[PDB]
Amino acid sequence: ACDYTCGSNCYSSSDVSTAQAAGYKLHEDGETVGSNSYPHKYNNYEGFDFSVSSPYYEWPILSSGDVYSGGSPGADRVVFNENNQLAGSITHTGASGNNFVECT
Numbered sequence: 001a002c003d004y005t006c007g008s009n010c011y012s013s014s015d016v017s018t019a020q021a022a023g024y025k026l027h028e029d030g031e032t033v034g035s036n037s038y039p040h041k042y043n044n045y046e047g048f049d050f051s052v053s054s055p056y057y058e059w060p061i062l063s064s065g066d067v068y069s070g071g072s073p074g075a076d077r078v079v080f081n082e083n084n085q086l087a088g089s090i091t092h093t094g095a096s097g098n099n100f101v102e103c104t
């Protein structure tokens, strides 16, 4: 079973932690990869009720299992704060426009 179901995609905590660990390293180092400059600040326009505190940063989590290193970011993202705490997994899949919804 999936710990997080992003529409069609299936993720386990292991996928979540591994992807977060890559986004936080880049964040701490002040570097970014890809056209959308990842990772970047997640303003939370949606107004999700995260249990960890801001600021939040979003980073692509991939269905392939590979860690994001450029190219298409897909539709899924892991949101984590300054302390390297996971806020949750979200996705563009099932949401209008460029909005997000949390993963099942």
Ligand SMILES: Nc1nc2c(ncn2[C@@H]2O[C@H](CO)[C@@H](O)[C@H]2OP(=O)(O)O)c(=O)[nH]1
Pocket: 036, 041, 042, 043, 044, 045, 046, 058, 098, 099, 100
């Ligand atoms: N929907 C949404 N987009 C955000 C948020 N914070 C930053 N963004 C960025 O704002 C722009 C319009 O949604 C996009 O560039 C999006 O980045 P991503 O597309 O990389 O998620 C947020 O909280 N919600």
Ligand SMILES: [Ca+2]
Pocket: 010, 011, 012, 015, 065
């Ligand atoms: Ca997996």
